[PDB]
Design a protein around this ligand. Sequence first.
Ligand SMILES: O=P(O)(O)O[C@H]1[C@H](OP(=O)(O)O)[C@@H](OP(=O)(O)O)[C@H](OP(=O)(O)OP(=O)(O)O)[C@H](OP(=O)(O)OP(=O)(O)O)[C@@H]1OP(=O)(O)O
Lengths: 215, 245, 227, 240, 237, 805
Amino acid sequence: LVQIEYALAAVAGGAPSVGIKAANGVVLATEKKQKSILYDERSVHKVEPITKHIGLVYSGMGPDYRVLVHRARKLAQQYYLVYQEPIPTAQLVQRVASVMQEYTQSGGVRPFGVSLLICGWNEGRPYLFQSDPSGAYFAWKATAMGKNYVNGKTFLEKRYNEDLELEDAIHTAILTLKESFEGQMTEDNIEVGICNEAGFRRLTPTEVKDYLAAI
Amino acid sequence: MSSIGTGYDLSASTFSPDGRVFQVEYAMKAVENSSTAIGIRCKDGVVFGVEKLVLSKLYEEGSNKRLFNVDRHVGMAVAGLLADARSLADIAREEASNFRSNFGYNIPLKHLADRVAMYVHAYTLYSAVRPFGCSFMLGSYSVNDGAQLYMIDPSGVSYGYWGCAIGKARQAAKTEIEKLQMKEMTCRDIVKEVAKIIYIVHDEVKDKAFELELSWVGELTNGRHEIVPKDIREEAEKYAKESLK
Amino acid sequence: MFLTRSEYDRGVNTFSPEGRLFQVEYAIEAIKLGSTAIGIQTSEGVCLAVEKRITSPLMEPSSIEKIVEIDAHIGCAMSGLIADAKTLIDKARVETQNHWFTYNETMTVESVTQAVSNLALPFGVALLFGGVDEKGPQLFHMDPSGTFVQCDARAIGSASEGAQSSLQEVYHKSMTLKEAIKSSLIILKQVMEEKLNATNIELATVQPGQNFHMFTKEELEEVIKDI
Amino acid sequence: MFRNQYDNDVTVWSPQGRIHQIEYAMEAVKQGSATVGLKSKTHAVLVALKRAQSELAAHQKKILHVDNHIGISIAGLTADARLLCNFMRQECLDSRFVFDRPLPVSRLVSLIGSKTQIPTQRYGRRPYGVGLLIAGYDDMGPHIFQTCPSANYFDCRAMSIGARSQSARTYLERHMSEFMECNLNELVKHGLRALRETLPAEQDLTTKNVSIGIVGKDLEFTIYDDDDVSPFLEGLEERP
Amino acid sequence: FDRHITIFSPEGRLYQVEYAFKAINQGGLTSVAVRGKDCAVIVTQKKVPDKLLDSSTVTHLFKITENIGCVMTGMTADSRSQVQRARYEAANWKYKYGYEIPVDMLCKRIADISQVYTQNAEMRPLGCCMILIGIDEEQGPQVYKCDPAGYYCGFKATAAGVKQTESTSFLEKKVKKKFDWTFEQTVETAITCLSTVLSIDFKPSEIEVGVVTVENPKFRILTEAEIDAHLVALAER
Amino acid sequence: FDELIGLWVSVQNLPQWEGQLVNLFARLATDNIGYIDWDPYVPKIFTRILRSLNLPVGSSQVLVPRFLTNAYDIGHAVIWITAMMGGPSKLVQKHLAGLFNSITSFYHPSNNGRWLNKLMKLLQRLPNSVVRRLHRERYKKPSWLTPVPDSHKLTDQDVTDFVQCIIQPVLLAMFSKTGSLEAAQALQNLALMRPELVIPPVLERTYPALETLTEPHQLTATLSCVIGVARSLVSGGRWFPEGPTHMLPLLMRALPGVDPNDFSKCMITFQFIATFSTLVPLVDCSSVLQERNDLTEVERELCSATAEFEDFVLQFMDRCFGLIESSTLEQTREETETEKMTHLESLVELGLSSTFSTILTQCSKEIFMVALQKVFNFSTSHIFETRVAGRMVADMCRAAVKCCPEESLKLFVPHCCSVITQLTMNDDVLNDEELDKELLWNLQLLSEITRVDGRKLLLYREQLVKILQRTLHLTCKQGYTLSCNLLHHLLRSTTLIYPTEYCSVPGGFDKPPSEYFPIKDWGKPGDLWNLGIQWHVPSSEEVSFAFYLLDSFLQPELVKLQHCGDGKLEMSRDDILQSLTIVHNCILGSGNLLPPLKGEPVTNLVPSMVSLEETKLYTGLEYDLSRENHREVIATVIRKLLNHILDNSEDDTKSLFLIIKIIGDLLQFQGSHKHEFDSRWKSFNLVKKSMENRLHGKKQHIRALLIDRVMLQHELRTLTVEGCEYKKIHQDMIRDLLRLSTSSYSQVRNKAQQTFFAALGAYNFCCRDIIPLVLEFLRPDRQGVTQQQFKGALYCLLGNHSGVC
Ligand SMILES: O=P(O)(O)O[C@H]1[C@H](OP(=O)(O)O)[C@@H](OP(=O)(O)O)[C@H](OP(=O)(O)OP(=O)(O)O)[C@H](OP(=O)(O)OP(=O)(O)O)[C@@H]1OP(=O)(O)O
């Protein structure tokens, strides 16, 4: 379909999201600039938990994004009803990309204009995944999304190594946003979430501020 | 003026580049090609008046009633397209019936008008339906809330009115209702005024025969909406004929 | 000859400014494509002739049916291929049998034609219901529009009008059934121009005495012995 | 040549404020043969002129039974008139079953209009290409109703629908001042003289093309066909 | 047909969603919400063009619950419809979940509904803007605004309508200069902002103010004598 | 001939050689017209042409077997038809009328089919070729080519009968569903020969079409078909005098076409108002009742309709204001902004600013001051966003500024300088990264207000450098970008050679005596000789302003970037990008002044026994060689800064691109862009062909495109530089470029290769110069180049579609 390529055009116009799979965890940093000072930046969140162990982030269209945040969380908890076990990250990406593929097959709708970076931690082992608006999903070591994702994907390919820790992966995920930020990021205009063995959590801005001070 | 052929005006499910839904506008332009219904609320009631055109001398002199009893305390004066107006008469009538069956009392005007303006609005955003081509006034009276007169256009907006006019000569009717102290007059003066305003805005050299239909609701009818007596109607007829001269 | 189309034809559900549905118009005057079929209603019974157009002598002539039995008192001759007609034929048979089940009586030819015409509401089959009920022998034409009408001689199919103009002339009210069968064969031989034998025409009669009866090969060739 | 952007479906308003599919269905009734309906104080007579596909075919029906008190006559698509007859017959049966009384004719006509407004507003469905002329008798006396493809219904003293029925309306409006005081035979002859003036100069009302439907006070709705229109046509005058 | 329905352009845009914001500007009216220390006000203008109209029925301030109010800007029937849907979702939150709906959850819910209009092709986006105010039990005053795109955000102040961009420039110069707060100033800021960009020097029959305060969280619609008590206090300074 | 045409007639197939053979007799018929009779042959040519049209005839009788593929192109069949008609026996005209009587059902808009693509070709090519025959016979001078005899020239009735036979398929094809293009060309060519038979039907079909609201397919048809009929409509022609009286009625009634809703009719309305305003001097010549005689009853009624020209250029302009006011952005996304302008709306500002500049050069000084006040109040008091709506207003403003430079600039430049000065005063706006958007709009307005006649702008010299002293170094990439293109348009207005007036009447048109008569001059086509182009050649005063403006705004940041190449000036990546942006717009504006790169010739390329010499074309400026060449110092600074970035800050994906652009224009750009000249050239032939008075043969054209053609000759002259010496300073430009062609990031490689491929077709024998340096990276034994250096060296070695390989 042509609407899938045009939906990928709305993803590449979105804000940068960078996710890096470290040895002991996965980061998911995004670009969150407010258009003016009138907007409460505390209010809306881009990095978003799905379970206690899976979070995700996007580039593209936020209202399309919340539709799959809601349905990822439903698929996850209806897995948990059946198995009483937290859902594997790869299984959840199969479910969500099946949902995201459904809106490309049916006529009278458009595809999602959103591409997800699903992170996870299951069985002592981290996961980085990207679901495209087609319904296709790819496992990643590190990747970029949104505005100039190509330049981010080759900035990551230079600074990625496998024996990398989670804190150093936060440091090189801030740098991949900072290669395209346009104007001096702060703890109030980016948003990072990490998975580790303790589960997924979105970093508090006081905790983002010290990572930014380390750079 | 000039036509448009890009086709933003073919469904109600489409905005124009300057932000209009033209199918709603073309339905509202179907209303201003119809004869004028006026409605005036007063100190003790709401009075309706329609210049019901008689486009064959073969009809039964009371055919095509553009005044409706939608509940026993609410009445409906329609302009625009009759078949759409009778559909909305059945909708407003069913909505009043369902309110009484569920909540146990008569439907309030401002709630009937909102629940019917929502139906009229729900036919203004889909490609499978078209907007209604009728604007209509709802007028009620009771004891607790006083006189109530709302008008609903094809867009689905309902506003309250002291006087109101819908149809092709609605503007000069707004003028000649604006020359009138409706907040202090009684219902029996407003019928004379409604009849003379209907007889002023009626161009006989375009559409040449009509029947003036009046309906009131108020204190004098115990809050019931009725057609009103032929005696009072023909006195209003004579005052409108003599008044015009 | 050339090409004469407008903006108001072949719109599937759209009136023209003269109140006409020309998508339906051209889909009714495309069911003239069927082979010719003449029914004649007489007082001695109704007769039904249709041309058969056998392809090969390896093919059974009794396997392409252009006159079917609706019930023992109603036959029907279609024009067009059988597979278009066969839901209408099965509907007619089921309606006669449901009318029998509820009412213990034979359904009239008009009511069978009305029950088919309800199911036709296009469907692209012209039918000729000929039969005998308590109103005597009756013949009913039902064009693909769904319009049915009693008619006491009617030709449907490829040369419907040229054969109908001949049926306007041979027919009279005091016509016997054998004269009707001979006249229908003469007009079939005219609109066919072939030699007339028991392999290119079917013929069936519904008489007030006997049931629906298809002519066999021996009984058919006695008719063309003097045509 | 002058191709119209707005006469595509029924759910499209023209910028002139009009719906062209409804307007174009309004002249599906002038594709039907003429039919006069007229009422007296006691009776309501539907006179229709019907045509044959050939001289051997048998004259398509136009007056149709709906109940013992309601009978209609049709002009336009006889396939839509069949939907309307099935609907109206079932409404008459439903209220003779629930209330054990005949329908008010105006309530059935209102119910027809509410039925036929629905394809004038919803996509992919055409307006009913028939106009009915509805005779009925009930508690309020006899009634003559016209329903049109615009889903607008008319209460009539007398009415003619169908092709070149202007001339009948020119007859009927001229003579409606004496319809109420007629007996039955004079009311039928008024309807016939209205129908006779929807004819060309060489044509005449015969027993094969005229169909007459009468309902009244002490009379159920009866359709007078071929032999039965002979008392009604063998009292008229020569064509003026 | 790529610009008629809500499908993507070749550069990834939804043109009907863009034209719904043009449709908001069709109303001619500008709304402003600002947020204080313990208060959040909404002010819109009340242009009544027809003088034999009941002006008590023309209002864009709507009660959603007792604690949540709402100013609407845009196509008016769309606005009443989105108000009825917000009132439904508020009552159903209270029924299913046992507590009053937060302002962010209601505004998120209405934006989630609006996304469906932006994604199915058979209906249009609903061309109007909702601004919700209300007092949160833990966060204080909340001002939330959802657009026909399905976005929502929380706002230190915001604006909706014809003069939205200049009202945003005014309030943006305002909220980086002071921390505007107190009951009186926040009505001052929302009256001055509307007045500055419309430039028409208000009389109280011409605007309408809706407030929530932390001291009494009931959504109030201001009396015309109370808009006088703010306009006289503002018009001599 | 008798051999070969007997061979032609005796076959009835469609061999693949008999279409070769009709290509031969069409060429024979044209070159020899008072000769071979064609009279035994014409009933066979015409009937084989009709068979070639392969129309479906009869009761569905089909031709799968029949030859549908070739043998009868109507390009040559038209030529062969039009070369046979004339002479004592028309026979050929009788057959031609019979042909179009045979096809008249198939030209009807309801009857479209696969035949219509070639039946439209007959209709668009046949009156054109008759125009060319009439020009060949009448208005072409005596020459060596064999002249047509008097016996076989087209007469009065012979061409009236052609118009009378062909026009009903043409009018029938006006309303075609394919798009009315090839009927408008027929209506153009038929109106050159018989305007009295052609124009009254098309405006009999135009005034209803432009009145209706249910048939919108007709407005696009009957306006595109009045474009081609326009030069005939505005002239009269001594047998259709009513002609023009139809202009300003039809011009006023077409104003609701300027519409936010239709792109499709707002294009044709702009293109209609632009073609019916170059054709009329819209000076208000209605105060002539002192002129009792010397006038025509048409010219009297046509000058007492001229007073509605304020009511056109103001009612037009509210139509153009509302289209801007609903052509704004309306940002729907929270995450990002759009910041670009789609193709569909960057045409309705080319059409807008095209027809508004076309109007405004064709209005008098009385009309212009009202239009200037209406421009100024709308741009001043209705503050605009800087992407799509303010892009439209500011180009509407510079139309008024480009017309009368001295009065319109007096309104904008004091206002915009004062309003920028009041909003830049706080001195914390330099390090503010947002720029509150009243500064954005007035800064955009002033940026585009200044690409105008530079002599008329040296008055506002002092207080316009002061607006650049403060805004260029302001850290916001909407605002130094809108202030360096202010510097761009200020240099190239002051440095470059361009005409200034483009009016239809030479060297005047704002003249106080209105006692003579401007509305007997509607048309006046061509006049190449008494043309009178007002050129802007740069004087010494404005060349001095350009070098001052270059020594005040290029030299400090050139010093800054030169220090940044050193171990001085640890400089920010957003600050390097800013300085390279100033340098790029300063070169890209002041290119014509500074002479190209020179140096020692590269040595060991090719033995060259004759000579290898560059062409030295003058182009009118006389390079100042006593000043320091400013290309060389900039190349010196950006090579060293390229070494700095490609070794210290590899990831700087934004400045690096500008190293690519500045190499690309140091090496190439001398005042004129190649792509802009190409776009202009393409536009010129489309405007020329749609107004081509083919029948007359002295290049008669609207003075506007005839001045634009001399500007194209100047741009073609300053743009073609031949095989100049490769000159080792250019070798370093292409060595360092390769280093960008094979770099870390794929986007800088892709943009770097396009200036690389353009560098190689510019210097003779330099593709051969770099063969072993592209090929270094793809050696098997050169240890460890990279993945991306290898991929870049073979993209470099692949070329592109239309350059070197
Ligand atoms: O320079 P361009 O853009 O390529 O176009 C040149 C053409 O190409 P060329 O110069 O050979 O490369 C050439 O046409 P052909 O040789 O192919 O027939 C000239 O024809 P010519 O003058 O000999 O022939 P006549 O005069 O038409 O009889 C000119 O055509 P016209 O306008 O009709 O001629 P006008 O220039 O008006 O006199 C035209 O001059 P413009 O620049 O104005 O378009």
